[model samples]
Target: WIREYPPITSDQQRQLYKRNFDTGLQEYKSLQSVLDEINKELSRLDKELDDYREESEEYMAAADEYNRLKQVKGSADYKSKKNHCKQLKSKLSHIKKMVGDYDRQKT
Candidate 1:
């Protein structure tokens, strides 16, 4: 994934260094600032994407478990089935909230 934001090319860096020697201070500063901002954003996006991926995995697992429990409920006559359903509903709600929080974060 680091390839997505590959390091500045050696030739380009040499050019910038040369310009810096020739009193091209403004150009060097602008280039440096822009690259810094870009790398910062790349790091932020990588973290956000990682978290989103993890949340997705968690949601999928929760959903699978919920479905399994529902199937089990259909075949059972246990008196505590109602309580089990309530707990599963709460768990699903919590998972939904977790996903919503991830969705609402600034992109």
Candidate 2:
């Protein structure tokens, strides 16, 4: 585990304990900046992902009507409702592609 403190013989290695504690503090201080940056990206992605994937009334009704009343495959309302699902799918794919591209944009 990367979580638990490694066992230290404090009675025998008091100096070592202080040194490890100081070094860990430094490491943790520096890492906070990285955590903030990551959380920023995660927050942005979370909101947009939630927004795009939401089953709003518009989408719910579209899906419901399409599911229950089956006309000819790919008919007028059939094709439009099918297209709405496809369009909804597009936002996710677009986000995925944008994130993938943004990977190389990372410093």
Please provide, for model 2 over 1-107, each residue's C-alpha lDDT reduced to its tens digit, 9 standing for 90 to 100: 11223333243443444555456445545545444554565455455545654567655554544443333333565455445545534443443344444444542
RMSD of 1: 26.0
lDDT, candidate 2, equals: 0.46
Query: Residue by residue across 17-40, what tens digits does model 1's lDDT show?
Result: 344334433434544554455456
The residue pairs in collision within model 2 are none
RMSD of each: 26.0, 21.6
Instruction: Please list the C-alpha lDDT of all candidates, in the order they appear.
Output: 0.46, 0.46
lDDT of 2 at 43: 57
Give per-residue lDDT, candidate 1, residue 72: 44
Task: Give the runs in model 1 whose Cα sits over 4 Å from its true position.
Answer: 1-23, 54-107
Worst 10 residues of 2 by lDDT: 1-10
